Structure formats: structure tokens, C-alpha cells
Amino acid sequence: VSLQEALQEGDTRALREVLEEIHPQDLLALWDELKGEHRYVVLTLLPKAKAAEVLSHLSPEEQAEYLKTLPPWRLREILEELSLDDLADALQAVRKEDPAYFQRLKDLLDPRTRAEVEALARYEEDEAGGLMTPEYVAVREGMTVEEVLRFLRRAAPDAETIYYIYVVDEKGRLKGVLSLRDLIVADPRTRVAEIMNPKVVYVRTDTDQEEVARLMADYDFTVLPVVDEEGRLVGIVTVDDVLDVLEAEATEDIHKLGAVDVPDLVYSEAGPVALWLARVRWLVILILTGMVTSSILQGFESVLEAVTALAFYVPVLLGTGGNTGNQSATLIIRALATRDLDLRDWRRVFLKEMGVGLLLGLTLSFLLVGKVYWDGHPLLLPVVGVSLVLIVFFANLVGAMLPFLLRRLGVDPALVSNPLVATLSDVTGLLIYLSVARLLLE
Amino acid sequence: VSLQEALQEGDTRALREVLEEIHPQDLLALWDELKGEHRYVVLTLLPKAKAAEVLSHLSPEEQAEYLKTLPPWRLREILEELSLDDLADALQAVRKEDPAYFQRLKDLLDPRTRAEVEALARYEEDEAGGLMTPEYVAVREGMTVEEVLRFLRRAAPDAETIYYIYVVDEKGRLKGVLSLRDLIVADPRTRVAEIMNPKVVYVRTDTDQEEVARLMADYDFTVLPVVDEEGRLVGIVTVDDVLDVLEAEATEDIHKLGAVDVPDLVYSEAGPVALWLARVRWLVILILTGMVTSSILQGFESVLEAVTALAFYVPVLLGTGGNTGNQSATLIIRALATRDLDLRDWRRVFLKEMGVGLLLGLTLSFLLVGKVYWDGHPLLLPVVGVSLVLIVFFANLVGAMLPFLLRRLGVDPALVSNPLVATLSDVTGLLIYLSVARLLLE
Ligand SMILES: [Mg+2]
Ligand SMILES: [Mg+2]
Ligand SMILES: [Mg+2]
Ligand SMILES: [Mg+2]
Ligand SMILES: [Mg+2]
Ligand SMILES: [Mg+2]
Ligand SMILES: [Mg+2]
Ligand SMILES: [Mg+2]
Ligand SMILES: [Mg+2]
């Protein structure tokens, strides 16, 4: 963290001596800790490589932000020494802000590369496309080892990775892998179609990130081959590239465990007006059904004017019944995602749960009713116990069987938030404290 | 999914023709879909490799489970053709169940390997140790390229990975990397200390998984070098190995967003008794403070017998106030984790939020109070609006400033669940509907 010295004079000499011995990340680490001036000045000095990298690892918006400021003499320079896949996605960041700057800034790009990027924008950001890089290593089945090792002796600094060589026939279709770990021990005269592997795993141009992701986690890979409608090899996907697709779809899920329902969402980047518009979309439909909570507490007013001396027992009661429905749904929901359990594993849970439900209800009842007495209302004390428990159970069995419900209909169970619960757990959670009090007084 | 044929006869011939052409994973996929008999019989047929693999990818308990049943003539067989790191962790799985079987089963292990694993158990399963594998590639600074490429021509099938060669001096200390991608283009006569990289990133033997994980996501690596107290290179960590550490610490986090507070937790594996003991640890402390919710609704009974005609407005009211505190805490909590925001970023949120809070409260008030009239209680209609709003705000500002609170004291913010909120959001959320009704009647 000494860089903050060879930069205060705004010279040239003492600065360049640093922007060559420090790793891109160190910078990224102290980047959001910089000033609108230093940054605007550093992203125009580090070498072609470093500058490019440090950019691809910036918020999509923070990227296009410095693609409108940075001097045009460096644009046609960075865009090149910048990995293609990282570009494609990054280049798009701009489009969400300036549909013109795109068409224009795009020209600064060499037509030899542009035509390639003019194909990675046609693929969604969900499917393989928006992740696959064309800079791969592809050989032919009718070649030698001494030949492939010599083919990589060159064109090695122009391919995302030469550790996994793919094989394709004349028509361009894939038909086998070829670990370099093998090209090193094999005999220099051996054919390629004899050390290769015909049983190759792949991913279609259109496969949800999550899906693609999973494969590289089970099959313990690091490089997945992307194919097209017919079967031609048109791109590869790196692991450090998908290692993010996780934290992303991971934070997208932790998010939908609240109201917050917006695709890519960061925090430091979003004015109060922004959070508001989204957060309040949900917070509202939620208090539409919750509204019915108080409307029903009305229909049963006749007998309620009798439950006059009590009813103070709807907070602790309707809440604990909610907390339950949560743990339940939480646990099952993530499960459905971790490929643990399934659409066919619902019976098995329904049951398994009934046990935990009535199991808890009892431990809890002893606690609530133990004080529902000591508090000062020994009168009608069954309404409390019979309900808390008759509910904790009825609740845990709701949040537990709901997530499945969605999947049976095709919908990210993550949608079944905690509040969607702490609400429907108030709806039904009340009707019980009513019949368990009405037909407990006549 | 044809395997279910060459297995019904319980023969020998037609079965082994399958357990040779089927990938380990296909099996794992249909493993939890098998019977206590087929499994117990298949894990004794597949070749040394496949059988070993399929085991390392099984719940820690489901592992040690089949290490007490499987025939002893296969144990000293699997435990060998089984990667060391995966063993270490796996062999421990047994220890949490049988402190004897361990000491014993351990014996079937070749002393040459045993002494190696008798060192991977002294490292926590949180720290690097429980993840680092000793089967790495380490060379010396004073060697050539044609020499390292020739050193890998052999001992290639006994190293976790030879794609990233590490350099160390005579005393065994690390001092540079060496990408194979380089050993391929460099001149066969070039020394090692001239194409290597002195600026190497590393991880100490004791570094929380998450921490070690992060590195391999930023520096876009795939192989991290593990060092010891002094600085000697004693192990490496694979990406596909850490790619899990994520989904793990990822699901540990989504879990702590409820009561569910237990380290490694799977679902299919946990008798209602299991879930119960943990889930109910939290659901209890939670309804200890929630208990206070109804005890306070008492202290204000004198004025409450007055609020007879009403008070049915505590469900929709105290709930929406809770839903708010959730979105808040959820968003901020995950942020603290995504390295977005910080312990210094508390002021900027407190403010940013005041806006969103009072912003929402109003949108919401319009909704609640719009019906608090049309419902049939136009009388004292301010108690509803003034509170809902005076609360939505005071709630969102709680769940928003709570996660930081813990971090200021060193505690995984994830602990601040949603229900921990939907409860404290009931405590304070009430006291308001009281002063906003008591000093609104005199
Ligand atoms: Mg894996
Ligand atoms: Mg990439
Ligand atoms: Mg998605
Ligand atoms: Mg999801
Ligand atoms: Mg509640
Ligand atoms: Mg930890
Ligand atoms: Mg990364
Ligand atoms: Mg490993
Ligand atoms: Mg965590």
C-alpha cells in the first residue's frame, strides 16, 4: 500500500516503476478506496495486460463508466489485450446505458475480433453463450503428439487455456478431449484418436448458468466445451469464470429469501429510490394478504367480545408459528436447489416432518403455557396450549410442502421467502386460535 | 439408467460389463435412489478407482456408514486408490461415530500413507489443512526446462496436478510458481529461476475455508500453495476442491437465515430427532424474547380495555413492520459478506435507509389506512397510519443496523436471521402502536 506515494506529484517517472511490480488485484483491492482523479489517471498507465484485467473485474456499471472517460487512444488498446469473454460481457455493460456509444465504441475494435464479439451478444447472459470464450484449443483426430505439442509451442499466448485440448472432425463437430497431462507422457508418434477420450461431457449454447455450473462441480472439471444446435464446438467455459456464476446465483437466492426480487443486485450501487421501487413491489403484495389477517379477526368479533379479557396471546402465538414455517421452508428450499431431495421426495418429507412438527409443538407448548399461567390468566389455559401446538405443527408442514408446490409448477422455490411465510403463517395461524377458543367455551 | 437390469439376478457376469463403462457420477445420481442391498453389493464390484471416487462424494455420515459394512477385503484396497485429501476428511467422518473403529480401521492403511494422514488430522477441517493434498509438484530454482519436463514425464500419475509447478529452496521454503503453460514455450536450456514468478500468493496451514476460497476467486487461480508456520511448502489445494467449500459455507449461511444452527447439515440425513434437537435450540431462545411481546401487551391493559373496540390491528401491523426489517437485514447481511460495504460503511447506510424507510412507510400507510376506514372503523384512524409508518421506518432501520452491530463485535452477521427480526420487530413494533394510541386518546 505504498503506491499512494509515487502518484501525489502527478509526475510520470516514479509512478511507472510501481505499475509493473504490483499485481492487478492489489489495485482492485484499493480501487474503491481511491479518488475520482487517481483512478481516471491510473487506468491509462499500467501495461496493456494489467489495465485490461483490472477492468474486467469491476462492476458492470463501473466498467462502462470508465469506457466513456478513459482517453480514446487507449480504448482500441485495452479492448484487445482484454480476454474475449470478459469483453463480450463487459462491452455489453455499456449498452445498458448508451445504445449509441455501443455501436460507436465497437468500431475501435479490430474487425477480426469484432465479428467474433458480434456473435457473443446474441447469446443470453443466462445460457452458456454469455460465458463461453472462443479462444480455445481445437485439434484433429488424425494428428500426432509431437504435432500438437508443436502446435501449442505457438498460439499459446492467444488461447484462454491450452491445458484441455478438444478434438473435432472435419465438419467441426466435437468428438473427444485430450488432457495435456497426457500429451506430456504419450509417445511423440502416437495418433490423437488413440489417447483421446470419446466419452466427452458438454453443454449446449443454451443452458442456464446454474446448470452449466453444477457439471463443473460434480465432474470436478475446470474447462467445459460449448456446442451448438448441430454439435459443433464453438466455445469453452473456465471454472474461475463459473466460480462466480455460483456466488451470483447464490446471492440471487439468498436475496429472494426476503422481498428483494431483482436479478443482479449489488448494494453500494443503488440509490434509495432504487431499493424502494423493488423492495416495495413485494412488501406490498405481502400486506395485501396480511390485510386479510385483520379482516378475519373481525368476522369472529361476536365471540371475540367474549375473548374480551384476553387475546393478548396472538403475538407470541402467531409469531412462533411463523418462525417454524420458516426453518421448514428455508431448509427444504435450499435443499431443492442443492439437488438433495426432489419433486419425488415430497411424500418422504411430509411424513418426516409430521414428526418434527408435533415434536416441537409439545416442547414449545410446555414453555408458552408454563407462563400463560404464571403470567396471571390461569383461566381457559387450553386455548393457548392446544393452539400453539396444533399450529406449530400445521405451520412447519406448510413451509415444508410449499417449495415443492412451486417446483411441481416450475418456479424457483426461493420465491417462497420467509416473510411470505410469516404472513400465511399468520392467516391460518389465527383461524386456529379461533376455533381452538370458540369451540372451547361452549 | 439400464443398470437396474444386470443386477436383479445377483449374478456376476452381466454386472461387471456395466461397472466399467458407467461414469462414477451417474451412479451417485441414482445412489440415494437405491436399496440397502444393491448399494451394499455394488460398492464391492466397481474397479479400485471408481469405487473410491463414488465414496468421497458421499455425505460424511453416509461414508463412515459404508466403512463398517463393506467387506474388509476391500477396505485396504479402496483406502489406497482413494485420493489422500478426500481420505483424510472421509476417514475422519468415521471418528465422529466410532473413536475405536478409527484407530483400528486406520491399521489397514499402508504405513507409508498412514503417516501422511496421521498429519492431516491435526489440522482443523476449517483451515487449509483439511483441504490440502500433499501429492504436488515441487522443483528447485537451479534446474532447467528440459529437466522439469523430463521430471514430469514420470510421477505424473501420482500427483494431484502437474499444471502448476511450485519452486522451493533447499530448506523447503516456497519461492515462486511455474505455469506449465510456460514450460512448453520456454527454451529447454533456460534455468528455472528465470521464467518463474517470485511474487507468489499463498495460504497458511490455518486459514478459514472461506478465506482460502475467496483468493481462488479473485486471483482467478485453480491451484493454491499451502505453507507452514516457517514457510515450507506442505500441500496444495484444488479449485474443484474449494468450489465445494463455497456451496458449503453458502448453505451454512442460507441456513443461519432461520433457526437452523448446526455446522454441516444435510436434509435426507437427519431423523426428525436430528432436525428437532438443532432447529428447536433456536426456535426456543426466540420465543423467550417473543414471550415478552405478550407480557408488555399486559402492562398497557388499563388503557387497553379502552382500545376494546379495536386492537385487531396488531397482526397486519406488527407483521408488515417485520417483513421490512427482513428485506433490510437480508440485503445488508449478504452485503457484509460479499465484501460490499463494511464496518466503516454503517453511517452511509443508516442515512441511505432513513430515506427508504420513510419512503416505504408512506406508500404502505396509504394502503393500510385506506382500508382501516373502508373496513368499518373510521374512528381513531391516526393510530393506524401514524404507527404503521412510524414503525416500517423504525423497523427497516433496525435490521439494517443490526448485522453491522455484530461485526463490530466479531460475529457472523448471518446469525441475525429473519425470525430474529420478525420477533424484535414485534417487540418494538408494539410499543409504538401503544404510545401512538395512548397519547392519541387524551
Ligand atoms: Mg466436485
Ligand atoms: Mg473467462
Ligand atoms: Mg438464474
Ligand atoms: Mg436459484
Ligand atoms: Mg410476525
Ligand atoms: Mg467458519
Ligand atoms: Mg474470479
Ligand atoms: Mg483434492
Ligand atoms: Mg459464512
Side-chain angles (χ1 to χ4, degrees):
Chain A
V1 193
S2 311
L3 173 71
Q4 307 204 75
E5 222 69 27
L7 177 157
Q8 181 163 55
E9 57 295 302
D11 212 71
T12 275
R13 294 180 44 273
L15 179 59
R16 178 202 322 293
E17 185 189 72
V18 193
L19 312 192
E20 169 46 2
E21 288 177 49
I22 66 167
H23 196 292
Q25 288 297 179
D26 283 293
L27 206 148
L28 288 120
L30 309 181
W31 178 268
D32 64 307
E33 297 194 16
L34 302 173
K35 196 179 185 180
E37 287 203 62
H38 306 51
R39 299 164 57 185
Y40 201 135
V41 177
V42 185
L43 240 169
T44 54
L45 296 168
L46 28 168
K48 319 168 54 182
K50 297 190 182 195
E53 201 61 4
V54 181
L55 214 80
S56 50
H57 301 178
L58 282 165
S59 168
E61 288 161 63
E62 295 177 300
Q63 287 188 60
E65 200 75 297
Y66 298 70
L67 297 181
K68 303 182 305 179
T69 59
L70 281 281
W73 83 278
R74 250 195 187 296
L75 292 233
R76 94 166 304 304
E77 191 198 359
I78 310 174
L79 284 185
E80 301 292 9
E81 182 85 327
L82 177 90
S83 196
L84 198 155
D85 66 311
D86 285 59
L87 164 85
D89 282 28
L91 206 166
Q92 306 168 307
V94 176
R95 175 142 167 51
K96 286 179 178 178
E97 288 152 347
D98 200 296
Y101 196 75
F102 181 80
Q103 144 84 306
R104 295 266 271 176
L105 181 285
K106 179 145 68 69
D107 284 312
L108 302 184
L109 246 165
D110 187 303
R112 197 47 54 201
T113 288
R114 181 231 285 185
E116 224 68 54
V117 195
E118 280 268 278
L120 306 209
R122 298 200 173 194
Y123 286 126
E124 321 269 293
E125 322 184 16
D126 272 356
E127 281 125 56
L131 307 182
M132 54 163 207
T133 111
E135 304 166 293
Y136 58 80
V137 185
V139 308
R140 193 70 85 81
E141 82 258 68
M143 294 181 57
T144 80
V145 171
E146 163 191 57
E147 197 160 359
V148 165
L149 288 166
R150 174 146 44 68
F151 183 132
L152 308 196
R153 284 280 161 53
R154 326 212 80 204
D158 215 65
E160 174 93 86
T161 184
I162 59 170
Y163 296 176
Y164 299 80
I165 305 78
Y166 291 130
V167 191
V168 289
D169 57 51
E170 51 190 307
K171 257 58 187 299
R173 303 178 303 192
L174 187 171
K175 265 167 53 287
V177 73
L178 206 65
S179 60
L180 195 62
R181 185 203 202 86
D182 282 311
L183 292 186
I184 287 188
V185 285
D187 231 299
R189 49 187 85 289
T190 52
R191 287 282 153 190
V192 175
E194 75 157 351
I195 61 175
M196 145 190 98
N197 179 309
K199 299 165 186 167
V200 296
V201 280
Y202 55 121
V203 57
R204 178 179 292 290
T205 75
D206 48 68
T207 296
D208 201 293
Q209 303 171 49
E210 243 185 302
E211 200 65 74
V212 181
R214 280 162 185 152
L215 289 176
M216 215 157 305
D218 310 314
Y219 295 99
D220 285 35
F221 270 40
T222 156
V223 174
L224 243 199
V226 172
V227 308
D228 81 315
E229 317 169 67
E230 260 82 76
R232 310 184 299 117
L233 174 62
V234 292
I236 60 170
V237 194
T238 340
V239 89
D240 48 52
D241 252 278
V242 68
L243 190 283
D244 285 318
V245 175
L246 295 212
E247 187 128 285
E249 291 254 47
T251 182
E252 178 262 326
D253 281 4
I254 302 184
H255 264 187
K256 293 184 168 182
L257 245 56
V260 202
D261 183 25
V262 167
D264 258 68
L265 278 166
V266 186
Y267 200 51
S268 192
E269 313 187 313
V273 182
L275 291 69
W276 187 78
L277 49 97
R279 178 195 303 207
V280 86
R281 195 164 315 187
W282 259 70
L283 220 278
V284 130
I285 286 191
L286 205 64
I287 313 314
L288 155 160
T289 309
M291 272 222 106
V292 187
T293 177
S294 193
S295 164
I296 225 56
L297 225 194
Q298 183 82 320
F300 287 65
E301 65 149 294
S302 309
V303 196
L304 181 47
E305 192 175 2
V307 183
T308 298
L310 236 176
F312 344 136
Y313 280 126
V314 183
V316 183
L317 189 127
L318 211 26
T320 303
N323 302 307
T324 273
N326 266 40
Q327 292 159 298
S328 163
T330 297
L331 293 162
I332 305 185
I333 207 171
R334 176 243 52 261
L336 279 88
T338 321
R339 300 148 83 205
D340 181 7
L341 321 187
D342 234 311
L343 168 61
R344 61 145 92 296
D345 285 43
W346 69 293
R347 327 156 185 173
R348 230 269 295 163
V349 237
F350 199 170
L351 293 175
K352 182 163 181 168
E353 222 71 41
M354 277 186 227
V356 256
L358 215 157
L359 227 163
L360 290 167
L362 306 174
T363 334
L364 297 178
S365 206
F366 165 71
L367 301 156
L368 180 59
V369 179
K371 292 71 174 187
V372 178
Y373 154 80
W374 216 62
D375 244 300
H377 295 294
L379 317 85
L380 253 190
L381 180 42
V383 287
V384 202
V386 180
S387 55
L388 154 60
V389 193
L390 215 171
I391 297 178
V392 173
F393 175 98
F394 268 119
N396 208 96
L397 270 282
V398 178
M401 263 286 301
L402 201 44
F404 292 77
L405 182 35
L406 304 183
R407 182 170 279 177
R408 309 202 82 165
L409 256 195
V411 257
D412 250 50
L415 267 13
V416 180
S417 57
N418 315 305
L420 170 58
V421 153
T423 275
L424 297 192
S425 191
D426 284 325
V427 184
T428 53
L430 256 202
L431 303 187
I432 299 176
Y433 200 75
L434 274 179
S435 204
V436 170
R438 157 211 161 197
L439 285 180
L440 213 301
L441 209 279
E442 305 177 58
Chain B
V1 190
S2 77
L3 170 162
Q4 287 203 62
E5 161 47 278
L7 185 56
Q8 193 177 59
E9 50 185 291
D11 196 23
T12 296
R13 279 151 47 273
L15 172 46
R16 293 177 190 290
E17 183 193 68
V18 173
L19 320 187
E20 172 64 5
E21 280 185 58
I22 53 177
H23 195 294
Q25 302 296 166
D26 288 65
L27 282 68
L28 248 182
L30 312 183
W31 183 272
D32 67 310
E33 285 196 356
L34 294 184
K35 304 206 166 186
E37 281 177 51
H38 293 63
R39 273 137 66 174
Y40 185 15
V41 182
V42 171
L43 249 172
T44 99
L45 318 168
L46 312 168
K48 284 179 61 185
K50 294 183 184 177
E53 167 69 352
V54 74
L55 196 111
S56 152
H57 303 203
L58 233 189
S59 21
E61 184 191 0
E62 219 182 312
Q63 279 191 314
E65 212 173 301
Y66 283 125
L67 266 173
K68 265 190 297 180
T69 35
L70 279 293
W73 56 275
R74 172 127 287 192
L75 299 190
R76 74 144 308 297
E77 183 181 8
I78 323 168
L79 283 73
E80 273 266 351
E81 195 79 51
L82 164 51
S83 285
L84 209 287
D85 59 50
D86 272 296
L87 170 76
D89 290 56
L91 183 165
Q92 298 187 305
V94 166
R95 189 145 173 295
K96 294 191 180 185
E97 309 191 4
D98 202 303
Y101 206 88
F102 164 47
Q103 175 65 306
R104 305 224 298 157
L105 182 171
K106 171 220 63 59
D107 247 292
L108 302 190
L109 237 57
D110 168 39
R112 316 160 90 72
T113 283
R114 209 218 310 146
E116 203 104 66
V117 181
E118 295 254 293
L120 305 200
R122 33 214 66 199
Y123 294 28
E124 308 299 308
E125 295 138 303
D126 299 354
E127 342 293 358
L131 300 198
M132 45 156 257
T133 165
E135 277 170 295
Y136 59 64
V137 206
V139 295
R140 202 70 115 69
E141 53 269 63
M143 305 208 107
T144 68
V145 181
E146 196 178 65
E147 206 172 6
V148 179
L149 296 182
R150 181 163 61 70
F151 166 84
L152 307 190
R153 284 297 177 72
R154 294 161 43 190
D158 309 78
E160 190 79 33
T161 170
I162 58 172
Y163 288 105
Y164 290 78
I165 301 182
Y166 296 73
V167 186
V168 306
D169 72 320
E170 66 162 285
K171 241 60 191 66
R173 312 165 185 289
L174 193 170
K175 172 198 165 189
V177 76
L178 211 316
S179 59
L180 179 76
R181 84 173 311 176
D182 264 281
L183 293 176
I184 312 165
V185 295
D187 175 313
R189 70 144 121 296
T190 74
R191 299 304 174 189
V192 178
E194 62 161 348
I195 46 182
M196 84 163 149
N197 185 301
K199 292 181 180 51
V200 78
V201 299
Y202 62 143
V203 11
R204 185 162 306 298
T205 163
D206 50 76
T207 294
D208 188 278
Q209 292 166 47
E210 253 172 288
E211 253 37 59
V212 199
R214 286 172 180 171
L215 268 170
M216 202 144 244
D218 309 321
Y219 298 44
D220 284 8
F221 265 39
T222 159
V223 196
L224 294 187
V226 174
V227 309
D228 64 6
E229 302 72 274
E230 231 70 63
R232 297 176 288 202
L233 182 147
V234 202
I236 119 186
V237 193
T238 332
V239 143
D240 50 285
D241 231 44
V242 51
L243 197 117
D244 251 46
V245 183
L246 288 200
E247 276 203 350
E249 288 261 26
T251 272
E252 168 211 48
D253 274 358
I254 292 196
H255 272 198
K256 296 190 180 168
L257 248 59
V260 194
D261 186 46
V262 166
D264 254 304
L265 277 167
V266 201
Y267 197 49
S268 57
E269 300 145 0
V273 169
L275 261 46
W276 186 79
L277 62 113
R279 308 235 290 69
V280 84
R281 170 131 42 187
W282 269 72
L283 197 49
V284 141
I285 184 168
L286 199 65
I287 305 318
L288 141 161
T289 262
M291 283 231 88
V292 194
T293 80
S294 198
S295 67
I296 238 54
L297 226 279
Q298 201 71 308
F300 299 43
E301 85 160 308
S302 69
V303 177
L304 175 51
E305 60 190 11
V307 193
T308 265
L310 266 324
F312 336 154
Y313 285 125
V314 187
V316 210
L317 182 297
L318 258 61
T320 303
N323 299 176
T324 267
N326 277 359
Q327 295 141 299
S328 172
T330 299
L331 275 178
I332 285 286
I333 273 189
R334 125 56 49 50
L336 285 107
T338 306
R339 318 167 94 172
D340 179 313
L341 302 184
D342 197 302
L343 190 48
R344 67 183 185 183
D345 209 307
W346 57 326
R347 306 208 175 192
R348 209 200 304 181
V349 269
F350 190 3
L351 303 168
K352 193 170 182 175
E353 255 326 317
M354 285 177 229
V356 213
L358 180 269
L359 222 181
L360 293 165
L362 312 175
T363 321
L364 297 175
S365 178
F366 176 93
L367 296 161
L368 178 62
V369 199
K371 307 301 156 52
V372 185
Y373 160 70
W374 211 67
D375 262 322
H377 295 298
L379 287 82
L380 282 184
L381 194 45
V383 293
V384 175
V386 180
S387 61
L388 176 59
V389 177
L390 211 192
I391 295 178
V392 184
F393 170 106
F394 260 82
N396 229 128
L397 288 280
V398 175
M401 279 289 117
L402 205 33
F404 299 78
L405 177 49
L406 283 179
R407 192 157 188 167
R408 314 178 193 176
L409 308 181
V411 183
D412 202 84
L415 227 50
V416 180
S417 68
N418 323 305
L420 181 49
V421 156
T423 286
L424 291 171
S425 201
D426 268 314
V427 184
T428 70
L430 257 193
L431 320 191
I432 297 174
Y433 196 54
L434 285 175
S435 76
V436 175
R438 102 169 182 183
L439 294 178
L440 194 294
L441 180 98
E442 304 175 298

